[model samples]
Target: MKVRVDADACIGCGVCENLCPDVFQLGDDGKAKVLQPETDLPCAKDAADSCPTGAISVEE
Candidate 1:
């Protein structure tokens, strides 16, 4: 799976980071940032599914 975070739509709610810290994190901008190294994890997609703003997206 491929994870694509909608930084523009992200509300900085932190749910994605909470659910999958390995793949998602709040950058200095306070929006969810996708860690390039951890993108292969299943949590990438899972976090997308759990995001409150529906800001996270999947490409695969």
Candidate 2:
């Protein structure tokens, strides 16, 4: 799965990063950043669900 964050819509809450630090992070701009461009990590699903704005997307 691939995780993506809408930089414009992101609230910079860091929720995704907190949930899956290995795959997500708070960039210098304070927006969510995808660390793993191509990942199938189990936590990816969980992180997507935890995003308050639902900005995280799971790509097949």
Candidate 3:
């Protein structure tokens, strides 16, 4: 699976980054960004779960 974050819906709360810094990072725009989408499955799941806006999604 891969994690996808909706940039428009992101509130820049940084919860996903805190939950899994290995997979998520706060971009220069202050929004959450994903790195190495398919490879970081575990961290990605955690990040998606912790997102308050439900902006994170898992794609097969």
Better structure of 2 and 3 per TM-score: 2
Using TM-score as the yardstick, the better of models 1 and 2 is 2
Better of 2 and 3 by lDDT: 2
TM-score of 3: 0.67
Clashing pairs in 3: none
lDDT of 3 by residue, 11-31 (tens): 878776666666566768676
Write model 1 residue lDDT over 27-58, tens digit each, in one string.
77776656554377677666656777665556
Per TM-score, the best of the predicted structures is: 2
TM-score of each: 0.65, 0.71, 0.67
Give model 1's TM-score versus the native structure.
Answer: 0.65
lDDT of 2 by residue, 1-60 (tens): 555556677787877767777776677867775667665677777776676656656665
Candidate 2 TM-score over all chains jointly: 0.71
lDDT of every predicted structure (CA atoms)? 0.64, 0.67, 0.64
